[PDB]
Amino acid sequence: ATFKVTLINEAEGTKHEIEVPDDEYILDAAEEQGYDLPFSCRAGACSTCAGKLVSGTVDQSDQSFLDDDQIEAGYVLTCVAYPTSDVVIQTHKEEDLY
Numbered sequence: 001a002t003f004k005v006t007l008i009n010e011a012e013g014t015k016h017e018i019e020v021p022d023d024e025y026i027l028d029a030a031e032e033q034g035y036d037l038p039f040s041c042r043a044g045a046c047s048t049c050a051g052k053l054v055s056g057t058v059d060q061s062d063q064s065f066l067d068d069d070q071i072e073a074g075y076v077l078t079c080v081a082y083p084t085s086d087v088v089i090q091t092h093k094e095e096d097l098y
Protein backbone atom coordinates (compact mmCIF):
# COMPACT_ATOMS: atom_id res chain seq x y z
CA ALA A 1 0.00 0.00 0.00
CA THR A 2 1.00 3.68 -0.66
CA PHE A 3 -0.70 6.34 1.45
CA LYS A 4 -1.31 9.90 0.69
CA VAL A 5 0.30 12.20 3.22
CA THR A 6 -0.69 15.91 3.41
CA LEU A 7 1.77 18.13 5.15
CA ILE A 8 0.55 21.43 6.59
CA ASN A 9 2.82 24.19 7.83
CA GLU A 10 0.24 26.52 9.63
CA ALA A 11 2.71 29.19 10.26
CA GLU A 12 3.65 29.75 6.71
CA GLY A 13 0.44 28.51 5.52
CA THR A 14 1.80 25.83 3.10
CA LYS A 15 0.49 22.42 2.15
CA HIS A 16 2.40 19.72 0.37
CA GLU A 17 1.12 16.31 -0.68
CA ILE A 18 3.33 13.23 -0.83
CA GLU A 19 2.80 9.57 -1.47
CA VAL A 20 4.30 7.35 1.14
CA PRO A 21 4.91 3.57 0.99
CA ASP A 22 3.53 1.74 3.98
CA ASP A 23 6.93 0.65 4.92
CA GLU A 24 8.74 3.98 4.62
CA TYR A 25 8.90 6.66 7.38
CA ILE A 26 7.13 9.89 6.55
CA LEU A 27 10.31 12.00 6.84
CA ASP A 28 12.25 9.94 4.41
CA ALA A 29 9.54 10.10 1.82
CA ALA A 30 9.05 13.86 2.21
CA GLU A 31 12.75 14.47 1.57
CA GLU A 32 12.86 12.26 -1.49
CA GLN A 33 9.98 14.11 -2.82
CA GLY A 34 11.60 17.52 -2.35
CA TYR A 35 10.32 18.61 0.95
CA ASP A 36 12.83 19.28 3.69
CA LEU A 37 11.41 19.01 7.23
CA PRO A 38 13.00 19.65 10.60
CA PHE A 39 14.99 16.83 12.32
CA SER A 40 17.92 16.26 14.71
CA CYS A 41 18.33 12.72 16.10
CA ARG A 42 16.41 11.01 13.31
CA ALA A 43 15.89 8.29 15.72
CA GLY A 44 12.67 8.80 17.68
CA ALA A 45 14.36 10.19 20.69
CA CYS A 46 13.85 13.98 20.43
CA SER A 47 11.10 16.46 19.63
CA THR A 48 12.61 18.20 16.64
CA CYS A 49 10.66 16.20 13.97
CA ALA A 50 7.24 16.58 15.77
CA GLY A 51 4.05 16.94 13.88
CA LYS A 52 0.41 16.69 15.08
CA LEU A 53 -2.15 14.48 13.41
CA VAL A 54 -5.26 16.10 11.95
CA SER A 55 -6.59 12.94 10.51
CA GLY A 56 -5.53 9.35 9.67
CA THR A 57 -3.30 7.00 11.64
CA VAL A 58 0.40 6.11 11.87
CA ASP A 59 2.56 3.59 13.34
CA GLN A 60 5.24 5.13 15.37
CA SER A 61 6.25 2.21 17.63
CA ASP A 62 9.87 2.98 17.12
CA GLN A 63 9.57 6.34 18.96
CA SER A 64 10.60 6.76 22.41
CA PHE A 65 10.43 10.31 23.24
CA LEU A 66 6.66 10.90 23.42
CA ASP A 67 4.57 9.85 26.44
CA ASP A 68 1.07 8.08 26.21
CA ASP A 69 -0.65 11.28 26.77
CA GLN A 70 1.18 13.06 24.04
CA ILE A 71 0.65 10.42 21.57
CA GLU A 72 -2.96 10.37 22.44
CA ALA A 73 -3.14 14.06 21.90
CA GLY A 74 -2.04 13.42 18.28
CA TYR A 75 1.67 14.10 18.39
CA VAL A 76 3.87 12.12 16.06
CA LEU A 77 7.69 11.99 15.50
CA THR A 78 7.90 12.16 11.70
CA CYS A 79 11.33 10.69 11.50
CA VAL A 80 10.05 7.24 12.79
CA ALA A 81 6.44 7.21 11.68
CA TYR A 82 4.92 4.95 9.03
CA PRO A 83 1.62 5.95 7.72
CA THR A 84 -1.08 3.27 8.13
CA SER A 85 -3.90 5.11 6.36
CA ASP A 86 -3.99 8.42 4.37
CA VAL A 87 -2.79 11.07 6.81
CA VAL A 88 -3.13 14.77 7.32
CA ILE A 89 -0.41 16.15 9.56
CA GLN A 90 0.70 19.55 10.74
CA THR A 91 4.42 19.90 10.77
CA HIS A 92 6.89 21.98 12.76
CA LYS A 93 5.01 21.32 16.00
CA GLU A 94 7.75 20.92 18.40
CA GLU A 95 6.95 24.17 20.32
CA ASP A 96 3.45 22.75 21.11
CA LEU A 97 5.02 20.69 23.86
CA TYR A 98 6.73 23.44 26.02
Ligand code: FES
Residues within 6 Å of the ligand: 038, 039, 040, 041, 042, 043, 044, 045, 046, 047, 048, 049, 050, 065, 077, 078, 079, 080
Ligand atom coordinates in the same frame (compact mmCIF):
# COMPACT_ATOMS: atom_id res chain seq x y z
S1 FES B 1 14.56 13.70 14.70
FE1 FES B 1 14.55 13.28 16.85
S2 FES B 1 12.59 12.28 17.21
FE2 FES B 1 12.67 12.63 15.01
